[model samples]
Every structure is written in C-alpha cells, then in structure tokens.
Target: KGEELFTGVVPILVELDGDVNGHKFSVSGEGEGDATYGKLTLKFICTTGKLPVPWPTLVTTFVQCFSRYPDHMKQHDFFKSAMPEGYVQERTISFKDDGNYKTRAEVKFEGDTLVNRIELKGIDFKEDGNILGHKLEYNYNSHNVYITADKQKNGIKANFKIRHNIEDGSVQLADHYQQNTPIGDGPVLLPDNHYLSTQSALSKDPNEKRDHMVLLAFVTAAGIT
Candidate 1:
C-alpha cells in the first residue's frame, strides 16, 4: 500500500503600496508549501508626521494567505519613539520549515486592545475519511517599546494571518490601515493554493527617526501516511 497519493508545492506572494492620511505606507509578503512544509515572509513600512505630547500613535501591520492542498487546508510587531523630521518605522519576518511550528501570536496593550494577532489554522483528515484532531500553536514577542503576536493551526482547513501594532506617542497618526480575509478551507484537488499576505507599519514621534522590528516563524507539518 506504499503508494504516492500526491506530491507538489505551491507558492503565493502579494504586495501593496500607497499613501493614507498624509502618510506613506507599504506591505509585501509571500507563503508557499505543501502538506509537508511551508515558507513565509513579511515586510512593512510607514512614514508619518510628528506626534503630540503624552498621547501615543498606534501602527498596525497584517499579512494573510490561503490555499488548498491535496486534501488538507491551512492558514496563518510594535514600537515607540520620538524625533524631529517626523517618524518612520519598518518591520519584517522570514521563516522556513525548520521544525519550529507555531499557530498564533497575541499581544495586548494595557489589557485593552489585541494589539498584534497572527494565526495559522488547520483541520486534518484521516485515511478512513474521518476528521482528525485539530492542531494549534501560539507565540509572541514583547519589550518596553513594542509587542508582537503569531498563531498557527494545521489540517484540511488551513489559513494564515499575521498582525502587529506599534504605539507612537501622538494622535495625528491614525486612520491609514487595510485588512483582507481568506475564503473557506475545504478539500479540493487543486495544484496551487491562493496566497494573500499584507503588511503595514506605523510610528509616532516628534523627530525624524527610523525604527525596525522583525520576527521569525518557522513552520513544519508532519507527513500523512
């Protein structure tokens, strides 16, 4: 019964760039793989004016992609500062299948808002055509200046989404944000899976300064019998 039922890999990449609310912003990301492994990367940047005293500006970046496997499905940062020539912030993440599997990332700001959220969701199917147990993983990174969240789940219903936020001390830094959602995850015999990933960065400071945030996520899935 040692038969090769399927063997293939699909890659998906997406990017966006524009200006919103007097600020220049851009996001680009890509994800590719099969039921054996997956690869993902995200890049985000935003430049804006100075921030007022006491108040902080919030910058959020997000990326998501969805695709159908032979039978299974799948799915899948912050900072602060001040300066003179306005504020600029950049964030990035690159990951491959290195056995370090994760399903989600959740970061909270003062327990009020879900600042950053990243998720990878999946549902497995057994050889007998029955549903297997669900798999989920969550992770995050934080510091005195910013925070990040990431999550992942594995199986027939697979999808990926990554979201992050940066708190800049000001109010003039709001409104320029974008979001996208993946379609349903079901059993389909398609060769390639649709990929949809997004990225955005925000900063709030008085002086002209640059900030960078980076996160790494390596995901690897077990092979089916």
Candidate 2:
C-alpha cells in the first residue's frame, strides 16, 4: 500500500530574542512533523521589563500547542483562482494567551515543488495597543526565502520562530545528495538526516539597528509515500 500523506516527521528547532517596546523577551522551542500531526513546545521568557497588566503577569508562558488539520476540505477561493492544479495543506494553532496569539502554517505543493508559509499574529505588544505580526515564506525545491514584518503598523521589535514539515518525495536537502562534500568555501550543509535551516533580520529604518531576527528550518526523510 502507498504511504499515507505526511507520514514523515521533520525535526525543527528555533530561538529568537527581541525587544517590543520595553518588553524584552525570548522564544525557543523544538518540534517534530508538521503542525497538524507534530507538536510544537515553546518557552516564552521575559528577559527584561514586563508585559502589560490584564495579560499574563508572569514572565514565562510555556506555549505548547498542536496544529489541528481540518477534517473537511474547505473552500479556498483565492488559492483555487491562483493555482488550479495545486494542492494546499493548512494547519493552525492557538497559544491560549487570552486570545492574543495564533499561528497559521501551510504548505502548497505542485508535483515535487513546494512552498511553505507561516504567519504569527499577536496583540498588546506596542504601547499604543496595536497588533503585531510577521511572516516567513520559502520554497523547498528552489533557493528563495522571504520574510516580512508588520513594523509600520505596530512599531514592534521582536524575533520570531517559523517551522514547517514537508513530506514530498522529491524534496531532499543538498547535504543528503553529497555525503562527503567538502565544508570549505561553500554553503554550509547539515549532516545527513539533519534539519535544513535559514534565518534573517529586518528593520524599518535603514540606519536603525535591528534587534529582531527570524529562524526557519526543515528536515526530510525517506518514507513509503
């Protein structure tokens, strides 16, 4: 029998630090598989300063949520219009932080090529009480990565962690193709069966120092599917 879709588990780890106004904080965690089947356990700690009242006054919020896959295929008019033959798999998770934070991660694939997208949205990070959010999008079969932050609306400075699990037969890391490849004067490759990773930091002002960063990683394994 053919393997089930997304039966492979991809390990991911992420760490970030930044200061949103006066509330400096850090988020770190490890997860396996896609958000739907895998579990992501993260730790949020306030290194300096504190969050506003009516919110969790505690400095640390252990965020552990599982991404739930939709039971039925829902109508995606936008995607249907954009890619008539493409397949879209989406999952979502809520942090349970007074209904302030949530994540929507998805993978869109056409044959062997796939694109992973993630969105993180939260509120009450700015002094004026504005929504803070960021996005990290990338392609697994290609070599392009894009990161965007909602800085103009929130004036928030914070790092983020984005993770995804892809289980396409055509998807494999470069390192997996070459076992004895030299590690000098070229792109760094993780060992066999290791997670492929990427990161970036962005700022609104050209000259202003950027304290926030984004990290994204993925791992692939051979499977029956």
Candidate 3:
C-alpha cells in the first residue's frame, strides 16, 4: 500500500540507504538534513565500493545548488551557491557494519541573503561514471530539479529520495524514485548513437522504441480498473 503523506507544510525526519549497481556497484549511507523557505542542507556519509565520495565533490555540489538555474525561471531566477567551503560533520555513517565517514553542511541566510557552508571527510563517484552521480534535491525546497548531466551518459540510471522534516525542522526520508520517467524503467539499451529516452522513443528506431501498447495495457489491468 502507498504510505500517504502531506504534499506541503509537513515535515518528518527520515533516513536513506541504497545503490546504483546492477552488478558490482552500490551506494550505502545515511544522513540528516532539513529545509526552509526555498533552501536546505543535505549531508550523507556516502560509501561506494571501497572508496569515498570526496569533499570536493560534496563542496562542488553544495556550490552547485545555485549554479543551476531553473530552466522555466531561467529569465527571472537568480540562484546562489552555498558559501564557499561551507560544510561540517560531527558524525558520519559507515560503509561497513563498523566503518563510517564524517560529513556535514550548513546553509542559512546572511542578513538578507543565503549562506552555505560544507565540511565533509570524504565522498565517492567520478565525474562521468553512471554509478557516480546522485540527485540531492530533497535537501531543501528544490522544487523543479530535473536530471543533471553529472554522469552525462544516456545509460545513466537515477533514483530519487524524498525526506520529511518531522515538525521540529528535522527531515525524515519519505519516498524513493527509480523509474521516474516514462522511459526510465528497465534498461534503455543505447546503440551507436547513444540516446534513448522519452523524446527519441517517438522517432525512428524500432529497437529503441518502447512497446507502450503492451505497457499501458498491462498497467491498466495491473491495478484496480
């Protein structure tokens, strides 16, 4: 059954742990973060294979929050990155049963502006591997976060996580997403051209196109019709 939740104005503190590996890779970690009017903080003690997700990556990401402008708000939106090098972590989650890393981040307003600080022990993931990218939109009121080019490959797979800030401004993880797009589920086998998605599906390429006829029919009968 679906775990019901309030769409807006309710917060609950939660945790998350998962992976991106269909074979030899997986991401396991936990964190605590919160949000406020259009902004937030997300810190995860990430564990990948046997390495870490580094500080620069985390710092870069913190700084990136503002670097990415809303495509819709592109003309009128003005975003800002987290204050340079703004992060902190008193405790970090371990990759192994007894192994863990430290991580933290702070974002608040400065007078009439926003300030972001992040301090983390380490992070994992390279700039181009499919297993190396993550979507951290739930850290704050990041409403229009779409997939990014972090991994850049059409073969990239993403899973989204949503957390609730339980009343006291503390966030509780609420939902997770995998097949987020119409063509996002299963393997989107790419060929020489390397682009198979919701868009290209309607074009040439019988192998790349999804059998929506079967999918829609099955889904309609898969539930209470």
Candidate 4:
C-alpha cells in the first residue's frame, strides 16, 4: 500500500502537518465541493499564521481564472536558493496544461531544526522537458550531508528516526521509504540514526511524477507520508 502511492494514484484527502516545517499549518487535497468541482481542491489550512480565514484554500483547477502557460515564467523555472531568510514556512506548487512541463513544488523553513530547505520539480517527461534535481537540506548542518543524494550508487537512499517508548523511556530509530523505480527496489539499507528518505524517482508521467516529488518532499521534511 505504501509503495502504491508513488505510481500516480490520487488518494482521499491527502494531508500533511506542515506545522512540522515550523509553524502550525496543514496541506491537503480532496473533500467537499459543489457539483461544479469535486473534492480535488488544494488547501493550506492555517494552524498557526496570521490569517482571517481558518483555511486558506485554492482549487487545483480554475476555468478562465489564469493562463495555463504564460510568458515571463520559464525565466524563473530553475531551483532558487535565495528565498526570504525569515519566514516560518513557505511552499509553492506549479502546473502547466501544455508546454514542456506539468508541475513543480517547493517548501522552506526559517527556524526548523530538522530541515530548512526543500525543492521539487515535475517535468512532463517530454523530450525537451527538463527535470530539476529535487533537494532537501538541513537548516544548520546542510553542508555536511549535502551529498546524501550524490552518494547513491543506484537511485536508492535511506533515512532513519528514533522514537522513545513512553512506558520505559526506551528509544529506537527506524528506516522508512516508498520505493518506485526498479532501481529503487533493491534494498532500503543505509546508514542509521536519523530519519531520512530516498531521492525522488526522476520520471515516468506528469501526474505520477508530481506525486513522487510531493511524497518524497513530505517524507523528507515532515518525516511522514
């Protein structure tokens, strides 16, 4: 069931505690809409942020609301390292109807100890479509583990996390990953101690690729899927 998600399946009410990034907020899709649109809307519900509405919502699809492809867009389509230095959390998602790509996403944190920077891109997998490297870096110690992805001989990687049993104060860390490609299925073994995840499976289709990036970003940043 875990591995099935990366293969382009849309699930019911996908949820993520974006609060893990720093503030208290949630990201989700699915549930509750008029006949015009179904449950496929996207939302950023404010758990902790300055906002009047409890949930800041945006439908994934809009009719005549915006252009599917536009000028002055591709110029800024690469991974950017220069985000505002002090925001509790920030994330962006993009999509295209035609052209060379389909979706792109990003998440950043200003004061999280676990991770501070995350980036993802979803190419249409067309011949000219460019697949940017999906990245995650620690807020403070990023330089030390920057190459975690580069260290992969194959497309597989490992991450670990420790949980303390409240009953006895005993602690234990575990490995977790959702394998997609055949190369990623070989083994989940890697160095242990802290929670981590494999690099995104680079390609296949638009819907599935976006799912792959989103799932990897959430797991790597929030330590969950």
Best by lDDT: 2
lDDT per residue for candidate 3 within 1-225, as digits (tens), equals 000111122221212222222212222222221211222233323334332222222222232122222233322211122112212212233232112224333433333233433333423433442113322222232221223211233322222332322334544342322111111222222212111111000111245232110010000000011
**What overall lDDT goes with each candidate model?**
0.24, 0.25, 0.24, 0.21
For model 2, residues 1-225, the per-residue Cα lDDT tens digits are 011223344343433343333444544433343434323322222223333221121111111111222323111111212221222222222222222343333333334222333333344443332112221122222122111212233111112222221223222111111011111222221211212122222122245232222222232211112
Candidate 4's residue-wise lDDT over 1-225, tens digit each?
A: 111111222322333433211223333333221111111222223233432111201111111101111122212111111121211222232212211211112222123211122222222322321111111121111101111221244222322221212223322221122111111232322222223221211122354322211211111211112
**RMSD, candidate 3, Å:** 21.4
Q: 2 or 3: which has the higher TM-score? A: 2
Tens digits of lDDT, candidate 1, 114-139 = 12343322222222211111111112
Off by over 4 Å in 1: 1-9, 18-21, 30-35, 43-215, 218-225
Off by over 4 Å in 2: 1-5, 34-38, 42-66, 70-225
Q: Is candidate 2 or candidate 4 better by lDDT?
A: 2
Please report, as a residue range, the 10-residue window in candidate 1 with the lowest summed lDDT.
77-86
TM-score of each: 0.25, 0.25, 0.20, 0.19
Q: lDDT of candidate 4 vs native?
A: 0.21
Worst 10 residues of 3 by lDDT: 213-222
